[PDB]
């Protein structure tokens, strides 16, 4: 089906404690495949998925060069932003950056992105036409005008429609066993007594990939949206994901409740019942 590749960059200034901390990670879909950490001993871009390890020293040398250059621009950006927002030398601040591309289920270019946040808040983003910029702040306007005059969006359009999706497709092919797989959720229910008159019914989905999933409870086929406790999908640590959804079931009423699981790895959606 559909796929994406994304790179995430965080830079955090540390006044009086040296250079800003910089961390870059890259993902294809929900699978991390590279990392750089400016505090770490190696100073190299490093593999985080087995399928990227057989790329070759030209790859590792080049990506280490490019990632270090990203670290350096963010190091300038922090000083630049502090100037724009008239902020003191003393505080720690955060620049985040994300870019990358989606392909549709034909594997052709679908959507491109490139956006920045400052201190947890949208700063500037490339619009979907990849030709113009969204900026909310007055300070961000200085950036927008700089980028318009330097034709950064033209440069980014070229990369997102060409190189970005070409390398996504290469990775999809090279990592076919890991990236073009699905792991269907292995499911179960638990039942714990709150008190004498009700019990919590929890529907579990475990070891699934990719992360996208819908877990819902119905009672006589009516959706129980407002009475369902739902936790955030969470990583198992081994490349799979986990989720649960729970409802409070009054005594004798277990039979009215169904849990509904939708996931790409399932041959049909599951309807589960405590029985």
């Amino acid at each position: 089906g559909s796929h994406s590749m994304r790179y995430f960059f965080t830079s955090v200034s540390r006044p009086g404690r040296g250079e800003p901390r910089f961390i870059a990670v890259g993902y294809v879909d929900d699978t991390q495949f590279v990392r750089f950490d400016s505090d770490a001993a190696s100073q190299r871009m490093e593999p985080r998925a087995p399928w990227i390890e057989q790329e070759g020293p030209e790859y590792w040398d080049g990506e280490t060069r490019a990632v270090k250059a990203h670290s350096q621009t963010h190091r300038v950006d922090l000083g630049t932003l502090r100037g724009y927002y008239n902020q003191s030398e003393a505080g720690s601040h955060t620049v985040q950056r994300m870019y990358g591309c989606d392909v549709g289920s034909d594997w052709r270019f679908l959507r491109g992105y490139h956006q920045y946040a400052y201190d947890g808040k949208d700063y500037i983003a490339l619009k979907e036409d990849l030709r113009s910029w969204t900026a909310a702040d007055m300070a961000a306007q200085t950036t927008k005008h700089k980028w318009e005059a330097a034709h950064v969006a033209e440069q980014l359009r070229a990369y997102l429609e060409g190189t970005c999706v070409e390398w996504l497709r290469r990775y999809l092919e090279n990592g076919k066993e890991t990236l073009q797989r699905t792991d269907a959720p292995k499911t179960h229910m638990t039942h714990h007594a709150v008190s004498d008159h009700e019990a919590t019914l929890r529907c579990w989905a475990l070891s699934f990939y990719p992360a996208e999933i819908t877990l819902t409870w119905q009672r006589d086929g009516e959706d129980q949206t407002q009475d369902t406790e739902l936790v955030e999908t969470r990583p198992a640590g081994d490349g799979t994901f986990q989720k649960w959804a729970a409802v409070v079931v009054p005594s004798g009423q277990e039979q009215r409740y169904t849990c509904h699981v939708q996931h790409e790895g399932l041959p049909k959606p599951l309807t589960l019942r405590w029985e």
Binding site: G26, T73, V76, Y159
Partner: peptide, 9 residues
């Protein structure tokens, strides 16, 4: 593969 050109805010 990373974007190869410098961008400064």
């Amino acid at each position: 593969l990373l974007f190869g050109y410098p961008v400064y805010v």
